[PDB]
Amino acid sequence: TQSLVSSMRGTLGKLKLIKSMTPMYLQQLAPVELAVIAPMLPFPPFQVP
Amino acid sequence: EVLLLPIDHQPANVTTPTLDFTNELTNWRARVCELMKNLVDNQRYQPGW
């Protein structure tokens, strides 16, 4: 009944534009930290491409 | 003996003050409201309201 249509579209758009530092954390800082950690391991890294 | 003022003045037209809107700050408030009316007018920003 079109109010739920409008509120759905608004909830979508605002949920699209919420703020969160987590994606840029994953894109910039987390592999840097992970690489700094990675030699200090009892279980050395073991990857398959 | 000069005193710089950051807004504009015009001296007393008459000594019985009464309302007009043809001045600077009501002008400014009117333009800010015109922007906000235009912003709510453009539908691509909010689809939710």
| CB within 8 Å of chain B, chain A residues 21-40 | none
Q: Find the chain B residues whose C-beta atoms sit closer than 8 A to any C-beta of A.
A: 46-49
Q: How was this structure determined?
A: cryo-EM
Q: Which residues of B7-43 are buried (b: 16+ CB within 10 A; e: fewer)?
A: eeeeeeeeeeeeeeeeeeeeeeeeeeeeeeeeeeeee
Which residues of chain B are within 8 Å of residue A6 when distances are taken between CB atoms? 47-49
Tokens of B16: 């019985």
- Assess contact for B47 and A6: CB atoms under 8 A: yes
At how many Å resolution was this determined?
A: 3.4
CA distances from B47 to A2, B2, B14 (A): 12, 54, 50
